[PDB]
Ligand binder design. Sequence first.
Ligand SMILES: Nc1ncnc2c1ncn2[C@@H]1O[C@H](COP(=O)(O)OP(=O)(O)OP(=O)(O)O)[C@@H](O)[C@H]1O
Ligand SMILES: Nc1ncnc2c1ncn2[C@@H]1O[C@H](COP(=O)(O)OP(=O)(O)OP(=O)(O)O)[C@@H](O)[C@H]1O
Lengths: 206, 400, 412, 305
Amino acid sequence: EAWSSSSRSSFYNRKASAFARELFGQFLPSINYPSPMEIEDRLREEIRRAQLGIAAYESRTFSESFVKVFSATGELLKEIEGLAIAQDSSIKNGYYAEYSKVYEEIRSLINRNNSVSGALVVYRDALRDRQDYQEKAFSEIDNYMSSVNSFLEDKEMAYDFDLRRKYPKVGLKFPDGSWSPIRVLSSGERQLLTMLYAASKMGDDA
Amino acid sequence: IRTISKIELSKIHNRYNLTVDFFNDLNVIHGKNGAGKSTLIHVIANIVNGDFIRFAFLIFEEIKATYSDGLKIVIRRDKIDEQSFISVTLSNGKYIKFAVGEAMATVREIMLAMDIDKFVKENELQKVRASYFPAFRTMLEAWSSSSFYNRKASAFARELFGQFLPSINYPSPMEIEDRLREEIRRAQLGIAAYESRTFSESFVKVFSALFDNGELLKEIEGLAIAQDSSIKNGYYAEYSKVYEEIRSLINRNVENSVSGALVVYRDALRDRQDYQEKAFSEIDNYMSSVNSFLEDKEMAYDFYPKVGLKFPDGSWSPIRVLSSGERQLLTMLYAASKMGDDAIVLIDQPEISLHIDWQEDLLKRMLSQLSGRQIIVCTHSPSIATGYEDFMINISPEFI
Amino acid sequence: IRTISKIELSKIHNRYNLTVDFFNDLNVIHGKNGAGKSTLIHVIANIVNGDFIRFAFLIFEEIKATYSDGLKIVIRRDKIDEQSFISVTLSNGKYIKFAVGEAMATVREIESVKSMLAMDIDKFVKENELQKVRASYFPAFRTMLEAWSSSSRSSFYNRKASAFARELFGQFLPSINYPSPMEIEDRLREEIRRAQLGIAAYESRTFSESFVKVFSALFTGELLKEIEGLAIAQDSSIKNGYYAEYSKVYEEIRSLINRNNSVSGALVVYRDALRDRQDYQEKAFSEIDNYMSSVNSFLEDKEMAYDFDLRRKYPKVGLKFPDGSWSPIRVLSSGERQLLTMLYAASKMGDDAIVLIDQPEISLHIDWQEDLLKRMLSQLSGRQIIVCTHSPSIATGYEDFMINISPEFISS
Amino acid sequence: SCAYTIDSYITLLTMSSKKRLLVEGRHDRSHLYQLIYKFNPASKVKIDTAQDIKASDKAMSKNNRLKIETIHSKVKGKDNISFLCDRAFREFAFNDQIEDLLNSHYCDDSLYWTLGHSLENYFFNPSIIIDAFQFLSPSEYKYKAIELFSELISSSFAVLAAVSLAAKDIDKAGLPAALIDWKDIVINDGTIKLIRRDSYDIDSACVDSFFNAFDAVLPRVIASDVGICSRVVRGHTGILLLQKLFSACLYYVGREDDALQADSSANYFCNLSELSLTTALAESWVRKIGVLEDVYFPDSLLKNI
Ligand SMILES: Nc1ncnc2c1ncn2[C@@H]1O[C@H](COP(=O)(O)OP(=O)(O)OP(=O)(O)O)[C@@H](O)[C@H]1O
Ligand SMILES: Nc1ncnc2c1ncn2[C@@H]1O[C@H](COP(=O)(O)OP(=O)(O)OP(=O)(O)O)[C@@H](O)[C@H]1O
């Protein structure tokens, strides 16, 4: 990989396989272990697919909740407040992070003046469904990042998106807040990253 | 903004002089063979891009460039101690004189250019760039497909036609397809964010309608039918089902809150439809401009995103199967689009491989997109310049 | 001779068929964008040159070509057991058939000496006389192509340019056979040398025969004026640039007469010898002067002409300026070079071919476009010219030879 | 210049599959484009101008009508092209009263003539002139000037036609454009009387011949029908004459309030570009089509294409 980086993927490895078979004879198989750039592109594609599924599930959930809500207490508000605080303070909800204000407006609407409890429980169920679908969509990626970040000490692999740039940035995050690409990892960290992605569900069945 | 308004040429190629006065929106240069149309375009492109290091390869005496805002650049080629020196003098009085041989050495190696770009960045001479369409677009596109593309193609073309040739930076069709895919992804993510907003907004809106005191169902039916039959929707397209469920529950059961919820639902449907339309506004405008020219095919998207050509039998084909004239039509329409790069569009011979029915409408469809950019074309065809004879410029150089 | 008359296409790119009927003199082909004009020209150029191995790179079903003399070539692409095969069948029953993978392998071996398939193709086209007429192919990208060629080509030697152009525009593209201006200059020099050598042989024969007729017939005021005019016209011609002393000889002969029947015969055979030499000079330089008069009808501030100097023996061919300067033909602009090549291809000096020009309006001013086809047809070569153009200034005045192309799209 | 010849354009007609229309000038193209886009904003008709077609003949070089007639004659029977010309004073009788021998749009195998003298005669409906002048005015004394102008416009058409006929009798068509000034005009009770000013930049011979022709033609125009009279007025002449007539009525009725302001507004109106006036009249004319039955347009030509 140092020879390759000074000049590859699972499917496009002709020069690396040619160099390896030149060095070690032609019985040597093809170099099928992935590159970190391939891992980064796979992460970005999985994040985009998760976002698309989240949007579709949000549309379906809105449709189902509006169907459920028509033709029809305090603890519900406390649970909804905790859910709103959790979703507001989540990295995945960087595209929309104004749930606690929504909860406060709901509480002020209730507080200024039964059938409202059904709307409360279907709203809580919708928030729970969204939070679970976020975990359902990000289960493979969160499991992979939990496996990776269990080894890294002064950095963590993390994702960050924006409404300024629509390109979610994935790379090394320091506790001081700096962002770095994945190429700044050392040899051992890159080896751990590739071996964990090879054993991950995100990788292809092999 | 800033538009080119005057170009003066003195003893260029030691052969002729030529002063041209421009309009700020459209200029149609025409003239006889060898009149210096292409050389004028090269001088304008090199001046506007700020690539003054090209001027070491041009034999001239003095070149004056005047912009619209009054900024004036005078470029001279002086001779001292049997060495040629290029002198650039602004209207501010700041100037830079550099030797020709050093510029030639930096070209053969590819320091002085760092000083040049420091001078340019200091004086904001790269405020507006220029997109240069050469007369050899087709073979250059065929060569490059067999800004890094800009750099390599610029090097190869300067290898063939001399080093004074400006940087080729028109949008190639592969770049156009890639940028179209990027715009589709941005529109999808904006739609997702809009759904998450209107989700949380509509929850408190329905919650607001708890304590507030016919044709609505038909309008909701029309909106759900339109949204379900929309190509911009590929996922969660079952609004007809929930509409049928809603009308069934209505027919089973009258509260004003039900009507208010219908109002909220109708507003949410039409607002999502409005954001879905406004997110894909630029892409639909560009493809509507393109599909007004193509006869038996249609460039369209259908979502991973797929960008291609629909044929009337429904089959799909890539953009690479298009002809030469259709690819040139795509590039020239993308350069004048709003999603195209803001520059001064310089096209050399736009009539190449174009049927006359497209040549008559090329300038009309480029200017009707309201890009606000300045377009300067050099043409031999009267059908390009028809309907815009007020902007025709006839150049008759004074040969010495 | 043999001229093309009908091209029958079947499912080009599996979507359209085409059938075009041609004229034997001039065919101005126009159509919409993407109609299949360049594809039609490529098909004709591949068929006439006999380069059937190109047809493995086109998706089609059946291609029939009818010529004027009745010879029909039918090319059929079939798919037997997922293996695609090209079968070429002529009208006399002779046929060949090969595999597409075999053709691709042959092309790959060319990318590295004839193959077995190339030898079989050459045997098939030679024994069937499939290469009677050549085909000069002028591509649409020739302006950048000759700049590429002039930075590193001839009709017989265009291997590198054909390989580069087939790399850029696909392997169906025919070989780039159109003449370069260097080839035009070399051919002009050879024609001038051949005309001079024929003139020298004519000088020897006329000298011997005139001496015999003089000596046999040995045992007038108007005649001297006529001989004076002929000697002045002989002295004032560029073709006599190696010897230009006719007026001096005339004055010596007139002084010989003036100082003091049978001499009248010597005078009239002198007039006849001068007339015969002048007419053989016009005949031997007929094609060159006609071609240069066709070219110089377009050029404004220069004219192409030849010059002979007695010290050197290389006849100088090139551009002449009104100030007396001489420049070679490579200092022409792009449009003037296009005029030069497209007028040499329609000349009598060029090879017998079918002139295929794609987009003749490239880099031409509107004044030259109105006269290009007139000056190509005025040389009376007898060619069959097929031009694919978008310019109405090219096609003006020739609406009887205009052919519209409308392919038929088939649904599926 | 960079332009097509007659033969090249005829070949272009053979090659192009669009629906085409050929008119003389660019102003006719702009007006007809507005007319077409009103009925069909997505229409694909392309309008060419004979002004931008080079002619080898010196006489045919600047004779637009001769170019159109030549082209139409050489492609007589084509389907994709229609022609429009200006009738001028053709088919008009000057036998002591103005008589129109056609009284309808001419048609001969996609060759059409304007109903009036030229294309600008469609603008000579009084409502269009009112609307256009009201929209394009100094906005100082517009309402009273428009009211006075509306009074003058009924009888002024006879004066304008007499001026045009006097111009064509001495063949000095452009003479009233620079000879007559708005100050010479006097605003009467619906009529006007262009006094022969003693001082003129032009020579007295032309001025005297012009007034002799005007005097000899004025009773004949008076005896003619008003409706027929509004169509024989020259298109280019009439625009300027109306501009001066409005400058005169504006200064006449606005001087009492402020002579200097009225003079400035009147001179400002007289200094308005002809193109601005024609475009405003064209837009107003387009708007009045279909609203008023008295507004005409080449309906047959639009139907044909
Ligand atoms: N070194 C040179 N490089 C380029 N042009 C030169 C040079 N020396 C002289 N010239 C002349 O400068 C003129 C400019 O050529 P150019 O190609 O720009 O012409 P043009 O007016 O754009 O027309 P066209 O596209 O028909 O050639 C030509 O007449 C050419 O002969
Ligand atoms: N490899 C391919 N696969 C499918 N369709 C193709 C392929 N190559 C070309 N085509 C299509 O077939 C037609 C080929 O026409 P051709 O290349 O001759 O066009 P042209 O005459 O050069 O056109 P233009 O006037 O636009 O320059 C076009 O419709 C083109 O889109």
